[PDB]
Amino acid sequence: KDVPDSQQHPAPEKSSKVSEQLKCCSGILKEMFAKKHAAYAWPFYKPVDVEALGLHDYCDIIKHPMDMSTIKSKLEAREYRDAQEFGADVRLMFSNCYKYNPPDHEVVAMARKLQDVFEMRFAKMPDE
C-alpha cells in the first residue's frame, strides 16, 4: 500500500479539479441536446419507446441501458466522480445499439456521427 502524497492537482476547499471537468461534461450534453443535434440524436435524448418499434428483446440484450436524459440528471446532481465516468455511460448507450443492431443500421449510423462530435467534445478536457 502506498499513500498518494501528491493528489495530482492540489485544489482548495475540497476538489476544484473534479468540478471543473464535470462542468465541461455538462457543456457537452447541453450541446448534444441542442436542436442541431436533435435531427438524429432524438432517439438518444430519451429512453427508446420499445412499443413504437415493436421490439421483443431489449432487456435480453441490453443489460446496461443508459439515456441522455438520465445521465445528465446524475451529472446535475454531481454524483459523478470524474470525467472518465461521464464518458463511459455515454458510450454505454451508444454501444448498446452497436451490439444489438448491425453496424449498417439506422440508430448505429446516427450514433456513429454522435460518437464523432462526442469524441471531439470530450477531447476538450483541460488539466489546469
Binding site: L53, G54, L55, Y100, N101, V107
Partner: peptide
C-alpha cells in the same frame, strides 16, 4: 415482425 433489433425507426420516410 423484425425482432432481434431496433428495426423500426423514423429517419426520413420509411417507404422507399
Amino acid at each position: 415482425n423484425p425482432d432481434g433489433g431496433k428495426s423500426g425507426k423514423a429517419p426520413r420516410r420509411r417507404a422507399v
